[PDB]
Nucleic acid binder design. Structure first.
Ligand SMILES: [Zn+2]
Ligand SMILES: [Zn+2]
Ligand SMILES: [Zn+2]
Ligand SMILES: [Zn+2]
Lengths: 332, 46, 183, 85, 78, 66, 66, 130, 206
RNA sequence: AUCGCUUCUCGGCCGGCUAAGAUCAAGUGUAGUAUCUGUUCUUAUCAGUUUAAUAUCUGAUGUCCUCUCGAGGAC
């Protein structure tokens, strides 16, 4: 017997969303990722009716997705974190109404792995170097520079390898025209495996480390480390240089902490709770995801709880020194 | 180069060959063995 | 203790002589009995290096699948003096096989083992798959019975055999088609 | 005495000389050239520009992997430029 | 009783149809059915060693029902 | 090819001079007493022409005659 | 092989083998969007909190060693 | 007939045949007979001869991709913890060969292993039922 | 109405016939593989379809020689006739005829929100043709991420007897030189090819 | 009819001469395996190493006293 397969209704589930300018237009095309599917939408400034410009199936499990831009560049490419051992850089040709495969690079084995990258994906604000990472042991970097014709060329990889180290999340860091930085959440289980008592199960804090790419030395050295008080799930870029301070926000259990280097001391704030809540007090809270709103005038952040509570995160700074943090209830 | 130590295999095969062909034909017997000549086969017999 | 270790398993029969020396028997007991997994081959603890040529000298050289036999190549392949060989170079004749390209475009299309629960080991060939209740053709011929084999009439009177106690043979406690009169 | 270097695979294309020209590196075979070889500039640099991946002569061509090593995914490991020990 | 003596056979019978033949009753552990070398043919009498004795005494009871080539087969203890 | 003739000629010579030696389902020569395998029958024959092969036939000789 | 995590050997313990297959299962859960969503459905949480609890269970699972 | 051993070279070369066949036929649905042949392949696992052991390795690798890991692993389970050192050396070598590739797809096929005192060996995630 | 199909959470299918007089529950067959089972469906009396918690679809058929009354860990089993990885977990399986006047087909939803169908072939011609489709398409039009199609559909279990329609339909999106040149490798025309794939969809579904 | 001898008959085992006519083919090296032959452990006990278990390897021959390995006494 033989069976021919047909899809009829394509999956409506949306795992990821990235907003960039893919046509070189002042409008913002929204590239969203259905489960096995790559998808491209066009919302309308006036009526807001969301036009689907493209829907394509990649025949592979999408893992993470990020959009980026060359420095001061006109247009935006796409980086596809995949389940294969290949990162691919894509460009949507507005005319042809379909994507082209701009770059195909093979960093390792196939399928969702423990040590194989593609899991977590970060990129520099200036688009110099994109950093790709697995859950454990392997963190790789591809450096990007436009060619003589200003068409994108990808470099050779690098290696961040650190033994027996779990990576919670990786977020690009803002340093304008500098040696790029990266915020890697890490933890070491090597303390836990050699501790028959079970003490290392507790009393082990996830280490926040900033790697520094260095163009001139063309390797990636561990530079910054601080132990995190409590375990946060994810991090947030804080645009630095001209606009705002350069630092990272850390979303932690029942807290958010701006935690940065230089002389900058950490700033913690509790995650506010609603008056007269019916839930188990034993159930804490963190934030799910965050979408930064970046404006030539100002900037802020948007956070959400399990319960769906979006807050507007703000920074109170003295010059480049942030003194405190202000969170106003935004919506739900 | 052909010269060397005598082997039980070469020696037994020499027995059988001498039995079959006869004493006066040496070139025929040297033909079967490897790494040995007719003179060497004859003098090895006698 | 190899004794009490046999009380902790659904199929303790899996535990064997050297099994009690295992570095982790308290698991291997639970693995070896896993549902569809297959046993380890037995040729070790036998020092014979997995084979000898005793039973292997009575085997046929080979026999073709019937699909290849009907073709007719078998008769085509079957002798030559040396000067005929240097004549075979100077003379040479062509087209000795002269196969039918229709036939060899036919057989393997138009015309043309074991399950997972089995694995081969050294000496095993015929036996497991002649048993009480299962005999060969010819010996049927010497016996000369038309389609029970008649001494399973006396397996009525004298009783079920001590040697194969689990026995069932047709018509008695085993309620039979072709050759096989007992299982 | 002779074994892979296995440094991280870069974007540099492999280069085989006259001798090694047709060989798929790992399977040692000439069959079904399909994909392409990548080795790090740490293995391929300078006097190694256009050098053979094996003997150390000038590369006249580029190595192609077989289909055999493709499905077994061996082409994705460290750079298969043999180093003498 | 572990062994039995078996008379009155035809040489087309061999050690195999004895193997198969008496294991129909109960397994023959050790088979002995002489091959005569001189004229290369069998006289047709057999000796059988079993696992233990019970096999072979049941074998005395049941055993002499076999008929090899239309003809009678002797089985007795030994 | 001349090499091919020797293989043929050294099998026949070890067939003439030859009851124990045989050829298995493969091509090798074997001594069925001693259960030895021989690269060439003549090489095998010598083992067949040896004093150890001799003994193990006598020992099996006695072992049967008992 | 050694530098490839999950490599086994003859001296491999139970505990290490099972904690391996655990951690690999968890990386699969982080990997496949759906199966993750199944988990979120069954036991009611966010996708986030699920992945968080898993990342907590990465080092521990089965608890202390022996 | 060949894999059943007259002499080692038969097992070796025949095994190589099983390899290239196994890569070639992949995905077309013939796996059954390849399983049957895998039966006769399987005893040859044990030997010290370099060419036959590396041959058998290539063999079982191709058979890995063609048959799928599940069946492989179902032949490779019991050998892991067996008391002897030999069997563990080898079955762990095999299990590694099966492990590096397709490590992603192995998850489903690890059997149920009961939990002892200090450790919980049951993965309960798979037992969540809607 | 005759037999009963047990679905294990782990060891998958257990064929169980209920003897009415003895009232006994009878396991006469089981699967050759462990599979984590979401739900089952009957294509017919002798076949069973099943989905994996991991998002696989298997179909296992009894041998026609099965013993209907009986009394390592089993006696006789059933061969696995199909393995296909959807990549999306399937919580229900239902066989039906989607459209009036259409051909009977198999139906699977998934957890991702997608709804799709499996369809039998009525001819070896469309069979082999779609085979060449899949073949020259794959290498000539690789998947987007660089991930291979074949492996992705063979992901947990190797593909057996399934042609992927969503790859065959991408014939539309290829460049006209791809479309044409491939059609030549297929010895057809873009209209021929295209309509011939519209055949199955049309006839069976929308 | 028997013995011996003989004759016939039947059955079974059951390559010419010459100057011998003249003349006479071997690659290498790096790794590695297999198959032949020859030769060695009647060691007793215990302890340790070691092995799946063997095997193997590694160490010594109830204690004290007296007399000339043996004898006696005390345990
Ligand atoms: Zn290198
Ligand atoms: Zn070269
Ligand atoms: Zn290759
Ligand atoms: Zn011998």
């Amino acid at each position: 017997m033989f069976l021919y397969n047909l899809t009829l209704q394509r999956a409506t589930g949306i795992s990821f969303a990235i907003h960039g300018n893919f046509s070189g237009t002042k409008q913002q095309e929204i590239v969203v990722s259905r489960g096995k599917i790559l998808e491209l939408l066009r919302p309308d400034p006036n009526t807001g009716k969301v036009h689907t410009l493209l829907t394509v199936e990649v025949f592979g499990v999408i893992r993470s997705l990020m959009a980026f831009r060359l420095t001061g560049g006109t247009k935006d490419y796409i980086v596809v974190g995949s389940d294969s051992g290949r990162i691919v850089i894509l460009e949507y040709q507005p005319s042809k109404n379909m994507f082209e495969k701009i770059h195909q690079e093979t960093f390792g084995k196939s399928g969702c792995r423990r040590i194989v990258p593609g899991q977590f994906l970060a990129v520099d604000p200036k688009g110099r170097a994109v950093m790709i990472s697995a859950i454990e042991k392997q963190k790789l970097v591809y450096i990007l520079n436009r060619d003589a014709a200003a068409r994108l060329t990808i470099s050779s990889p690098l290696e961040a390898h650190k033994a027996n180290t779990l990576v919670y999340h990786v977020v690009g860091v803002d340093v304008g025209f500098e040696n790029p930085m990266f915020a890697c959440l890490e933890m070491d289980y090597e303390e836990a495996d050699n501790d028959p008592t079970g003490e290392a199960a507790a009393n082990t804090q996830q280490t926040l480390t900033f790697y520094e790419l260095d163009l001139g030395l063309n390797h990636v050295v561990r530079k910054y480390s601080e132990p995190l008080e409590e375990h946060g799930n994810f991090l947030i870029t804080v645009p630095g240089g001209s606009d705002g301070p350069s630092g990272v926000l850390i979303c932690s259990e029942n807290y958010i902490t701006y935690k940065n280097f230089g002389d900058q001391p950490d700033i913690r704030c509790p995650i506010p709770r609603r008056r007269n809540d019916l839930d188990d007090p034993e159930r804490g809270m963190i934030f799910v995801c965050s979408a930064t709103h970046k404006t030539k005038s100002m900037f802020f952040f948007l956070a959400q709880t399990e319960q769906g509570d979006i807050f507007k995160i703000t920074l109170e700074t003295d010059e480049d020194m942030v003194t405190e943090i202000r969170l106003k209830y935004f919506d739900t | 180069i052909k010269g060397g130590v005598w082997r039980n295999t070469e020696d037994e095969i020499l027995k059988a060959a001498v039995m079959k062909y006869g004493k006066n034909q040496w070139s025929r017997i040297a033909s079967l063995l490897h790494r040995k000549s007719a003179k060497q086969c004859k003098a090895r017999w006698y | 203790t190899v004794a009490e270790l046999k009380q902790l398993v659904a199929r303790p029969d899996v535990v064997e002589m050297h099994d009690v020396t295992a570095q982790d028997p308290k698991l291997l007991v639970h693995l070896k009995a896993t549902r569809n997994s297959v046993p380890v081959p037995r040729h070790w603890c036998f020092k014979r290096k997995y084979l000898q040529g005793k039973r292997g000298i009575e085997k046929p050289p080979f026999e073709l699948p019937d699909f290849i036999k009907r073709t007719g190549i078998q008769e085509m392949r079957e002798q030559k003096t040396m000067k005929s060989k240097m004549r075979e170079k100077v003379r040479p004749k062509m087209g000795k096989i002269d196969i039918d390209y229709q036939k060899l475009h036919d057989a393997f299309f138009k015309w043309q083992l074991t399950i997972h629960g089995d694995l081969y080991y050294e000496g095993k060939e015929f036996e497991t798959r002649k048993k009480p209740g299962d005999l060969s053709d010819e010996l049927r011929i010497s016996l000369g019975m038309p389609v029970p084999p008649p001494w399973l009439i006396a397996m009525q009177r004298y009783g079920p055999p001590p040697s194969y106690p689990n026995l069932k043979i047709p018509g008695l406690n085993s309620p039979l088609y072709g050759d096989v009169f007992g299982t | 005495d002779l074994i892979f270097c296995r440094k991280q695979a870069g974007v540099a294309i492999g280069r085989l000389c006259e001798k090694c020209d047709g060989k798929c590196v790992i399977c040692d075979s000439y069959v079904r050239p399909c994909t392409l070889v990548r080795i790090c500039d740490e293995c391929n640099y300078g006097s190694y520009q256009g050098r053979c991946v094996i003997c150390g002569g000038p590369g006249v061509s580029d190595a192609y992997y077989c289909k055999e090593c493709t499905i077994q995914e061996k082409d994705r490991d460290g750079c298969p430029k043999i180093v003498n020990l | 009783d572990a062994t039995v003596y078996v008379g009155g056979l035809d040489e087309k019978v061999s050690e195999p149809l004895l193997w198969e033949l008496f294991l129909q009753a109960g397994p023959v552990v050790n088979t002995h059915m002489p091959k005569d070398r001189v004229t290369g043919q069998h006289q047709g009498y057999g000796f059988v060693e079993f696992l233990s004795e019970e096999d072979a005494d049941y074998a005395i009871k049941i055993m002499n029902m076999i008929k090899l080539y239309g003809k009678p087969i002797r089985v007795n203890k030994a | 090819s001349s090499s091919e003739s020797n293989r043929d000629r050294r099998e026949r010579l070890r067939q003439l001079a030859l009851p124990y030696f045989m050829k298995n389902h493969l091509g090798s020569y074997e001594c069925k007493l001693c259960l030895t395998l021989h690269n060439n029958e003549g090489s095998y024959l010598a083992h067949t022409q040896g004093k150890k092969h001799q003994t193990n036939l006598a020992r099996r000789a006695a072992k049967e005659a008992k | 092989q050694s530098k490839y995590i999950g490599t086994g050997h003859a001296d491999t313990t139970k505990w290490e083998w099972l904690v391996n297959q655990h951690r690999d299962s968890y990386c699969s859960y982080m990997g496949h969007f759906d199966l993750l969503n199944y988990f979120a459905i069954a036991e009611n949480e966010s996708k986030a909190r699920v992945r968080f609890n898993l990342m907590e269970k990465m080092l521990q699972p089965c608890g202390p060693p022996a | 007939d060949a894999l059943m051993d007259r002499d080692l070279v038969h097992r070796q070369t025949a095994s190589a045949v099983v390899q290239h066949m196994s890569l070639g036929v992949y995905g077309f649905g013939c796996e059954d007979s390849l399983n049957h042949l895998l039966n006769y392949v399987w005893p040859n696992v044990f030997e010290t001869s370099p060419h036959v052991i590396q041959a058998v390795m290539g063999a079982l690798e191709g058979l890995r991709v063609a048959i799928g890991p599940c069946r492989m692993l179902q032949y490779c389970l019991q050998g892991l913890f067996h008391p002897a050192r030999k069997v563990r050396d080898v079955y762990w070598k095999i299990y590694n060969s099966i492990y590096i590739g397709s490590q992603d797809a192995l998850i489903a096929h690890y059997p149920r292993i009961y939990n002892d005192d200090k450790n919980t060996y049951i993965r309960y995630e798979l037992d969540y039922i809607l | 109405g005759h037999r009963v199909i047990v679905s294990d959470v782990q060891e998958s299918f257990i064929w169980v016939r209920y003897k009415r007089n003895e009232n006994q529950l009878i396991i006469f067959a089981d699967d050759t593989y462990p599979r984590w089972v979401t739900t089952a469906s009957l294509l017919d009396y002798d076949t069973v379809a099943g989905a994996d918690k991991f998002g696989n679809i298997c179909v296992v058929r009894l041998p026609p020689n099965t013993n209907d009354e009986v009394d390592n860990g089993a006696s006789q089993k059933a061969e696995v006739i199909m393995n296909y990885h959807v990549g999306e977990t399937v919580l229900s399986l239902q066989k039906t005829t989607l459209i009036p006047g259409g051909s009977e087909s198999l139906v699977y939803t998934t957890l991702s929100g997608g709804i799709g169908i499996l369809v039998p072939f009525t001819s070896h011609e469309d069979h082999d043709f779609f085979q060449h489709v899949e073949m020259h398409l794959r290498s000539e039009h690789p998947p987007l991420c660089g991930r291979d199609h074949l492996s992705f559909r063979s992901y947990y279990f190797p593909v057996k007897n399934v042609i992927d329609g969503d790859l065959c339909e991408q014939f539309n999106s290829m460049e006209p030189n791809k479309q044409k040149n491939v059609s030549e490798e297929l010895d057809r025309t873009p209209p021929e090819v295209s309509k011939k794939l519209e055949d199955i969809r049309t006839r069976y579904a929308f």
